[PDB]
């Protein structure tokens, strides 16, 4: 599908509200496997199970290992821009 | 298989 830019708004007491799988060491992108109901990713409306997370806040995640992506993603605060694609 | 993290 088309590459999309998606904005997510998160408070500091919350996580992103997604489960991710995959990563470079497995030869696949960082993939959203769950959107947890009522949490920030669900509320933002534009992120979905099956989306590959290509970048967050301009940080490329295409070639990132799983735990690298966890560190990068969990570091982001407030208004967070995602670049995603559903294949 | 691949790991999953909740974030």
- Helix/strand/coil percent split, chain B, to 5: 0, 45, 55
Please give the Cα distance from A70 to A72 (Å, whole number).
6
Solved using: X-ray
Closest by CA position to A59, among listed A35, A83, A86: A83
Contact A15 B7 (CB under 8 A): yes
Domain ranges (residues) in chain A:
1-87
Torsion over CA: A50, A52, A87, A44 (sign): positive
Q: What are residue A75's phi and psi, to 5 degrees?
A: -75, -20
**Alpha-helical regions (H) of A5-61:** 40-44
Resolution (A): 1.4
Smallest CA–CA distance, residue A24 to chain B, in Å, is 11
Residue A87 contacts by C-beta under 8 Å, 6 or more apart in sequence?
A1, A50, A52
Q: Classify domain A1-87 by CATH number.
A: 2.30.42.10
Asked if residues A42 and A9 have their Cβ atoms less than 8 Å apart, the reply is: no
Please give the Cα distance from A73 to A80 (Å, whole number).
10
A 25-64 → B contacts, CB under 8 A? 26, 28, 33-34, 36
Please give the Cα distance from A87 to A74 (Å, whole number).
24
Please give the Cα distance from A70 to A4 (Å, whole number).
21
A 10 A CB-CB count for A62 gives 12
Please give the Cα distance from A2 to B1 (Å, whole number).
28
């Amino acid at each position: 599908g088309p590459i999309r830019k998606v904005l997510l708004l998160k408070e500091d007491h919350e996580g992103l509200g997604i489960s991710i799988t995959g990563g470079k060491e497995h030869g696949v992108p960082i993939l959203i496997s769950e959107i947890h109901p009522g949490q920030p990713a669900d509320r933002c409306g534009g992120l979905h199970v099956g989306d590959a997370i290509l970048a967050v806040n301009g940080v490329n995640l295409r070639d990132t290992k799983h735990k690298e992506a966890v560190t990068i993603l969990s570091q982001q605060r407030g208004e967070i821009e995602f670049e995603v694609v559903y294949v | 298989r691949w790991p999953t993290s909740k974030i």
